Every structure is written in C-alpha cells, then in structure tokens.
Write a protein that binds this ligand. Structure first.
Ligand SMILES: *Cc1cc2c(cc1C)nc1c(=O)[nH]c(=O)nc-1n2C[C@H](O)[C@H](O)[C@H](O)COP(=O)(O)OP(=O)(O)OC[C@H]1O[C@@H](n2cnc3c(N)ncnc32)[C@H](O)[C@@H]1O
Ligand SMILES: *Cc1cc2c(cc1C)nc1c(=O)[nH]c(=O)nc-1n2C[C@H](O)[C@H](O)[C@H](O)COP(=O)(O)OP(=O)(O)OC[C@H]1O[C@@H](n2cnc3c(N)ncnc32)[C@H](O)[C@@H]1O
Ligand SMILES: Oc1ccc(C(F)(F)F)cc1
Lengths: 550, 550
C-alpha cells in the first residue's frame, strides 16, 4: 500500500514505498498491512494502544508486518538497516495497560512475530521444560499439553488471563501464581535475531548439537539444540540473557521455559481480612511464612474492589460518580462475603505435607480478629477463588477481564511500584497511592503479589477512554505517583509507553550512570538504531532526547 | 620499585616507573608490590598460579596493588587508561584449580581488592540479606554472624572450603550445598567500577535513597542504598547484572547476597552406593526427587577416591605409581565403610516435614542392592559426613583441603562439564572421562553436584607440580577432555587460565556468534582494553588473537 498516516523519522514517502514493496516481495501481500479501531482482547489491535491514555493516534504504526519465519526477520532487519526504519517487535501484542502493540515511536513497522511463528517446538518430560515461539499463548500451550495427555505429568504457570504469550511475557519479566511464578527466572536457552541480523543462541544454546546425518544442511534457525541448552541457563562466560528482557537489544525468536511437574496433591484457598488496616498485620504474617517456605506459590493480597469489579461494574454497586466511600467498601465486602483485603494461596504436595503447612498458615492468621478461611467449594458458583483455583494450578482463564469494565468505556493502566514485605511499608505505599487516587476522582483498585523478599504492587487505575478530562486526570495521577513513590524510596518494575522515560529518570543514582551504560551497549550493537528506539527510556544516538523523551 | 620481571604489552620501563610512582602516590608504598613463591591456602599468592600446570612464571604479574577504598580503584583505572595498562581484579585470589590470583596476560597489575576492602557492610534480618566487600571471606562472614548472635536467625551457604570470597565466588557462579547453593542467583544489588572509571549500581541499586540530613555530602561509594536494592534484583529496563559474572566488564566493589533463615530443624545424611555402576540407578532416582523437591539442598554424589583423599594421601593406601585398579577401589571402599559412590544430603524443617521426606528418600534408594543409610553420629570421628554436616548448614570448614595432597607435590585443576540428570548420560560422561584419565597415568577423582535439572561434574585432576612429564600429561588430558565432551554435546561451566580460549571455542554455534557479540559489548565499554583482557576468551580489539589465544 501507499500513503500511510504517520511515517518514521527522516524517511520519505518514496523510501516507505520502496521498503514496503520489498517487504511485500518477501512475505506476501497477505502478511503486510499498511495504515492509511481499538478491537478487543480476542482480536487484539496491532497498530496502536487500545487502552489509550494519550490521544488515540499518539502511539501508532505506519504498517504492520508478520514474518513467516526466522529468515524473514533476518530479511526485514537488513531492510530496516538499509533504510534506517525503526521496528517494534510484538509476540501477541496483549500488553494492554502498558501500551498493547503500539510502538514507542510513531511511524514504526510493528513486527507481528506471533501471527506465523506459532509453534510449541518441544515439550521435554525428563527435562521438565518446553521450547516456544513468540505466538504460543498460554492457552495454546495448555491445549498442547491436553492433546498429548501431558496434563498428568507437567503443569504450566499462568498470569491472571490466558491470552498472553509465554515468551513475550517472560521477556517482560511478568509474574504468575504457582511456585514457578517468576516467569523470566524459569527461562533457559533463548534464540535472538540481533540488529545487524545475525542469529545468536544463549547459555548452552551456544554449544552446538553434534553433527549427525539427520540434521545436516538445516538453516541455523531450524537446527536442534545441544542436550544441556534448556537445563542450565548460564553456559560459559558473561551471562548475557538479561540484556534481552525489558530492552531493545534484539528480536526474540524462541525461548525455553521450565515446567513444574505435577506435585501429586493440590489445594487452593482464601483467607479474608476484615478491615482496611489489617493489611499491616497480614503483610507482617506473610513475611516469615514466605521466607521459610510454608508459602509455596506466589500469594496475592487483593483489594475488595478488585474482586468486586470481576463480579460487576460500578453502576451495579452504586450510581455515584465520585469515589466510593470507606463505608460503602465495607458494605460491598459483606454483600460478597469477602474482607477488605483478600489473601489467595495454595498448598502443593502429598496430603501429609499440605496438612502441616495449612495448620501453620491458619494458625498464624488466627491472630487477626474476624478472619475467615475458605476452599473453593465453600464459595459461590461465580467466585474469584473458583477462578483462582484454576489459575494456581496452571489452567488458563479469561474471567478476570471483567474488572476492566468497572467504568463505562473502561481501559486499564498499571502503576507498578515494588515494596518490602513489611506491614509498615505496605501501609505507607498504599496510603500514598490512595490519597492521589482520591484527588483525581478515582477509586483505588489494587493488589499485591508476594515475592520472596519483595512485593509487586499493581495499582489498577481504570478509566473511560472517551473522557477527555479524566484521561488528563489519569496522566496527572500517573506522573505524580511516579514522583512521590521515588521520594519514598520505591521504583516501578514495568510501565506504559508514555511513562518509560519518566520512570527511567527515577533510576538516576550517580548522575544517571545506569542509563548511560545502557546507552553505550545499545549503540555498540545497533548502530543505525532500528531496533525499538525508546524502549525503557533507552534511545540510540540518532534520536535526540529533546525531540523524543516524554 | 623499578625493574619487574615481565612488563605489559607495549609499555616501556619509563612508562612502568611513572605509573608505579603515581600508584605509590595514591595508595602508599605499603600497598603496591613490584615483582623483580607458591605460598599456601592460608597465605595465598597474588603474583601467579600456585597449582601451576604451565611453566611457573607463565601467568605472572608485574606488580600487585591493593586499593584502600573505592575511590582508589577509580584513580588506578584512570591511570591504567592513561598508560594502557592491563588490570586483573581479584577479591581473595583463592581460585586455585582455575589459576589462583594469576592474570591471563603476563605483566598486568593484580588488583588485590580484598586486602583493604574487607567490610561486612550490612546484615539485615527482616530482609534476610547481607552486603559485602570483596575481602569478606566465608569464614569472615561466619565470624560476623557469631559475634552478634545472628547464627540463630540467619544461615550462610558455603562451598566445600571456607577461605573463598562471598562475592568473588558469586561473580564466578560457584556453588554451595544448602538450599541457597546457587550463589550467583542469590545476589541482588551490585556496585561496579566500569573501565571508563564511573561507578554503577545495579537493579534497584539504581533508585537512590532519598535525601535526608544524615547522608548529605557522602561520596557515591559511601552512600546508603534505597530499601528495595537487596530484595528484588531486576530494577527496571535491561537486566545487565550477568554481564558482570564470568566476564571482564568491570571491577566489582560490593554485592548483596540473600541469606537463608534458620529453618528450625536440620538433619544431614549419607547414602552409600556399593558398585561402580550404581551411579546409573542413583542418578535415575535423584531426578524426580530433585525436581519434585523432596531433595531440598544441593546433593552431592562423590567418588570413593574423593572421600579417601580427604582421609589420607595415596602413599597411605598403596605404594603403586600407576592408577589404582578397580578392585583396589573396592578394597578402599570397604576399609572406610563407604560405597563406590557416596550420596550426601540434608533435610531442613520441622520434625513432621523431615520425617515424611526422609521416608520417601530412603524408600527410593532402597531399590539399589546393598545400600546403606548413615547420620553423622553413626560414623567415625574423622569422617566426611561429620565435615559435610557443618557444610550443609552454612558452617565453614577447611578439612577437604587434604585431597589436594593425594600426590606428593599435589596441585589441583578442575575439569567441569555439565551433564543431564539421567543415569545414562551420567555414565557416558564418566566413561569418557575415566578412559582419558587412565591413558595419562592418573586416578579418576570427581563428584557431581546436583542442580534442579542439571549436574555440575567436577573432575578433580590432582598432579605433582614439580613433575615435567605429568605436567604435560595433565595438559594433554585437559584439552582432549575439552574436545571429547564437546563431541558428546557437553560444555564446561568454568575453567582455568590456560583452557579459557579453548573452552570458549567450543561454544561456537552459528559461526561463533556468542563470542562475536561478547566482543562488540566489550569494546564499547572498554575502548583501551585495560580491564582483564582475555578473561573467558574475550579479547579487546588491540590484543590480536594470533598473538594471545592459547
Ligand atoms: C489487562 C490485564 C493485564 C495483565 C493482567 C491482568 C489484566 C486484567 N495480569 C497480568 C499478570 O498477572 N501477570 C503479568 O505479567 N501481566 C499481566 N497483565 C499484563 C498483560 O496482559 C500480560 O503481561 C501479557 O501477557 C503481556 O502481553 P503479551 O505477552 O501478549 O505481549 P506483547 O506485547 O506481545 O509483548 C510485550 C512486550 O515485550 C517485548 N517483546 C515481545 N515480544 C518480543 C520479541 N519477540 N522480541 C523482543 N521484544 C519482544 C516488546 O517490548 C513488547 O511490547
Ligand atoms: C582447591 C579447591 C577449590 C574449590 C573447592 C575445593 C577445593 C579443594 N570447592 C569449591 C566448591 O565447592 N565450590 C566452588 O564454587 N568452588 C570451589 N573451589 C574453587 C575455589 O577455591 C572457590 O571457587 C573460591 O571461592 C574461588 O576464589 P576466590 O573467591 O577466593 O577468588 P578470586 O580469585 O578472588 O576471584 C575469582 C575470579 O573472579 C573474578 N573476580 C573476583 N573478584 C572480582 C571483582 N571484584 N571484580 C571483577 N571480577 C572479579 C576474576 O575473574 C577472578 O580471577
Ligand atoms: O505486571 C502485572 C502483574 C500482575 C497483574 C495483576 F493482574 F495481577 F494485577 C497485572 C500486571
């Protein structure tokens, strides 16, 4: 196609068309869409941000391209280098709340890796691992295990929803709820296409499988891996895998994620905490239980409106437009049989072991007045525990999508600071976020997901995307929370396209030495700067800061 | 001082003298040694390799320098860049079997960071972590916990011996035997001096502690860290921490390791395996127990000569010079009440939990004929279980040093391939390593340390350092094993100064793309190539390969 809405920096219309006709040459017209609609969670947009905070055409592509295979990524990269054309690599593009598929720089080509590079490449039982392409979603992998009856030997680890990409998510450092919840840390053996176009495989993925007749003459992308590849991440020398998570260092084509074997015994559960300030005693209780391993998985401490919103929109609870009051929160708590804060967990293993742990657990949370213990069966048909019962055993759902519909044309945006595992700190962080949320006229809706020694605080800001005024209120809230949290010693672990620079300016110890050194490595390997300029505040030398930061 | 035995590449004697007098200016004469003795494990040498395979002066320093503090490292770096002088940073220099303190390039300055930068900087109980300078040894941190009665709240994780440096070892990716065995993976928040000279702190060590009166005006090296620094390793953006493990990317000044909490119940144990081929069944049994978590720590499967060597030199078992026979191995096994292969482990936790796990463990290992279960008390006064009982609970020892004295002027050299957690593979690797060992006139002595999905096979070659003929035999064996293992799909995880280029040539998938990409990053940040040129086969652009590879 011919005249796009936005073009990339310094490129001419004649240049765009020579490039696109070249890309059409390589991947067929069926795999290249020019842009001369927000969609859903089932048919994800690939051109812009669907949960749009800035204007709707603010972060938008010039064309979308779907490589049919690894060589196609090599061809497109050389062309991007020929013309200086910035690319934006997505796997599924389901990063809503962080931008979705949109490119940080308008005019880029979005690289739809997933549409054709789809395959579960290997599921190895003795190694208890799998090897996946960008396009394998969580659901997809789950159906792969079920079609080969692997469900009885190996389990998955899913975030809250089922449409994400196993790899896309893992390269973002996302989180899940089984004992294998730190997705990125369960990776081992990635394959990458660099900016120059060369294929690289990490760790022991660099040790080649020995020559044998059946594998002779296969292109590099299509060769097998040597035995240790997906069993030990480190290989030899500098361990470079992290330069490929939350970065613009290369295009990820394949990855190995470790799978947890069926533990032969599972029991999900729910502890309800009666009052808004029981968060302080609860987090003090979780600390030693987490650190001592009575708490096997990644427990979540959810805020009442988070469960409530799954169950119904705000109009269904009050016709009010201002933030619901404290007492209306207590009111909803009791209608659902939930507390003010809800703790979701699970016990894994033989009966004998679960029993002892569940006893210490119950017994510890008993020192909190009015506390109450529930297993799925003890709760309503539509409950959140019934849904998390599947979530905490690797089975993918879609139910939690409904909280996004809290307000009319609801869109979410995550504010994700990290806090210690201490009641005092947790309260202090919540205090600070609640106050700003009220000032902007928004209900506070969050959850803490409990790591070993840290807590991911996901403040879930939901808002009406057709409201100009509130869209500006959310932009004012987001930046204010970034800054206040920084003045209290907390940083965010992940963000949306528009807060990237700001959030990265926050990590400025010693005069910004952490971004400086990121800038050096990025120019070294990406001299024409075509691989995702902007990602995480890291800009190649030819994109001036003054012109592009936000 | 004025005339060193060896000078660094392209430096003149007048250049060396100006440099050294400038360094004496900064750190005092008491801290700079010029080299115009192999020492021990108690007074480690810092000029060369004590467990020397090549000629003794082959890997040697021009001078040794001990910075008094971080600023001194900054000052020495700037002079190393003024003059183009290679530096080799050590913490303790106890890397014997891998080179000790020696520099890959002769004529370098050895940077003794340890001699003055010694402090346990913080031990935080609620966060269950610690902060350490190069110079804190394992023993040292152990004595720090005892002096403040922290031994009843927090435990350490030690490798076989106690003199290593908590940080030096962790940047090497070394291993230990409690559940916190993977050293490197327990780190969180490093401070680095880069080649350019700028200070950098990683992860959330990049988010600065908020301004307060008590901390104003402190130099960067001396500032506190923000609260999450040592509790979540990832920060935001690209996760650069691995570029500082097993690499020449910068000089490590401080690090944060995570400390296991006293688990309130401990029991160490020994399972003896009667026959040389029971290694196949044993590893098949270990697989599901490890992956299912009944095996809590990092279990070790040791070879009979490894325990026997701790107990006595070879002259004490046979006056023979040739490798001991199969039947003499069985002979020794029975004198010591050990098997042919010995499995060491530990159970952590309340009584109720240990009990169920110990039952599954025993019961699984019962399908191996003649098997026999021992707790420490059940064994002699001088046994290895008695020693490992302290090892598997974080208490530092020095007993296992005796195996180096297997032969007269015994020195060790490690050959460290990685194998699957499968009996078949294990046998195959052992097969291949036993035959080559027999061809060189050497006893096979090794152990496998059991990771979640992989095994570190440490073939412990010991040899007489004054023997010219055997010294060449050890050089012939080392390279042959490198190549054979690579022809069988296995790579080594760590190595000595002389095999470094060889081993890295082994990880050549896709025409050596993994070292190419390491070369790009290294030149980007180290333009005058003065931080440890050669480490892990990674050479800066001005050290021609043809002149320096081995
Ligand atoms: C709306 C929502 C989101 C959500 C969630 C609950 C709700 C209601 N719960 C989450 C959870 O529990 N854990 C979690 O990690 N995320 C959660 N989210 C957010 C989001 O839905 C998921 O994270 C989702 O899996 C992320 O999207 P997907 O995996 O589909 O992503 P993507 O945009 O394609 O990729 C994300 C970004 O990563 C980089 N990327 C992706 N692929 C590549 C390749 N091949 N190479 C290089 N970089 C790549 C890009 O920067 C991209 O934009
Ligand atoms: C002889 C021996 C060795 C041994 C062992 C048993 C015996 C009998 N058991 C070990 C075990 O169970 N686990 C293990 O990991 N190692 C074991 N070893 C080997 C060795 O003794 C230990 O690994 C020892 O702790 C390593 O030495 P140390 O920690 O004292 O040494 P280092 O030379 O100072 O540092 C090693 C290398 O790391 C890089 N390095 C070190 N410090 C820095 C800083 N500050 N910045 C950048 N790089 C650094 C260098 O490459 C250096 O040479
Ligand atoms: O990065 C994240 C992690 C968790 C969540 C959720 F759904 F649990 F809140 C959202 C975004």
């Amino acid at each position: 196609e011919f005249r796009p809405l936005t073009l990339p920096p310094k490129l001419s219309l004649s240049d765009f068309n020579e490039f696109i006709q070249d890309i059409i040459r390589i991947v067929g017209s069926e795999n290249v869409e020019v842009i001369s609609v927000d969609g859903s969670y089932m048919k994800p947009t690939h051109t812009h941000d669907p949960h749009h905070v800035m204007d709707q055409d603010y972060f938008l592509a010039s064309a979308i391209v779907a490589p049919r295979n690894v060589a196609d990524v090599q061809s497109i990269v050389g062309l991007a280098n020929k013309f200086s054309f910035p690319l934006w690599p997505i796997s599924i593009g389901r990063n809503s709340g962080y931008g979705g598929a949109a490119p940080r720089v308008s005019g880029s080509v979005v690289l739809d890796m997933g549409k054709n590079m789809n395959r579960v490449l290997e599921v190895n039982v003795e190694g208890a691992y799998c090897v996946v392409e960008p396009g394998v979603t969580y659901h997809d992998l789950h159906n792969y295990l079920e079609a080969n009856n692997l469900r009885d030997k190996l389990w998955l680890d899913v975030p809250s929803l089922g449409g994400g990409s196993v790899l896309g998510n893992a390269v973002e450092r996302g989180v899940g709820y089984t004992p294998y919840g730190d997705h990125w840390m369960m990776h081992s053996g990635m394959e990458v296409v660099l900016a120059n176009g060369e294929l690289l495989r990490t760790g022991m993925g660099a040790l080649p499988d020995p020559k044998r007749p059946e594998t002779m003459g296969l292109k590099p992308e299509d060769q097998p891996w040597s035995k240790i590849a997906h069993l030990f991440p480190y290989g030899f020398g500098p361990y470079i895998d992290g330069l490929f998570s939350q970065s613009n260092m290369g295009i990820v084509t394949k990855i190995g994620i470790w799978l947890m074997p069926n533990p032969g015994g599972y029991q999900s559960y729910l502890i309800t905490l009666p009052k808004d300030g029981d968060l302080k005693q609860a987090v003090d209780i979780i600390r030693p239980l987490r650190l001592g391993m009575a708490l096997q998985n990644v427990p979540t401490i959810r805020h009442i409106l988070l469960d409530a919103a799954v169950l119904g929109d705000k109009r269904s609870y009050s016709s009010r437009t201002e933030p619901l009051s404290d007492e209306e929160l207590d009111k909803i708590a009791k209608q659902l049989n939930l507390g003010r804060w809800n703790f979701y967990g699970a016990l894994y293993g033989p009966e004998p072991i679960r029993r002892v742990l569940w006893e210490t657990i119950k017994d510890a949370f008993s020192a909190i007045p009015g506390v109450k213990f529930y297993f799925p069966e003890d709760t309503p048909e539509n409950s959140v525990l019934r849904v998390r019962d599947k979530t905490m055993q690797g089975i993918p759902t879609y139910d939690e999508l409904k909280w996004i519909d809290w307000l009319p044309n609801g869109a979410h945006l995550f504010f994700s600071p990290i806090a210690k595992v201490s009641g005092e700190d947790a309260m202090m962080q919540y205090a600070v976020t609640k106050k700003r949320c009220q000032e902007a006229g928004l209900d506070f809706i969050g959850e803490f997901t409990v790591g070993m020694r840290e807590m991911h605080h996901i403040v879930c800001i939901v808002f009406n995307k057709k409201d100009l005024i509130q869209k500006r209120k959310v932009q004012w809230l987001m930046r204010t929370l970034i800054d206040d949290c920084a003045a209290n010693g907390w940083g965010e672990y992940r963000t949306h396209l528009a807060f990237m620079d700001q959030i990265m300016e926050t990590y400025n110890w010693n005069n910004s030495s952490f971004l400086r050194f990121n800038e050096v490595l990025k120019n070294a390997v990406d001299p024409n700067g075509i691989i995702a300029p902007g990602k995480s505040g890291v800009w190649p030398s030819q994109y001036s800061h003054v012109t592009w930061k936000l």
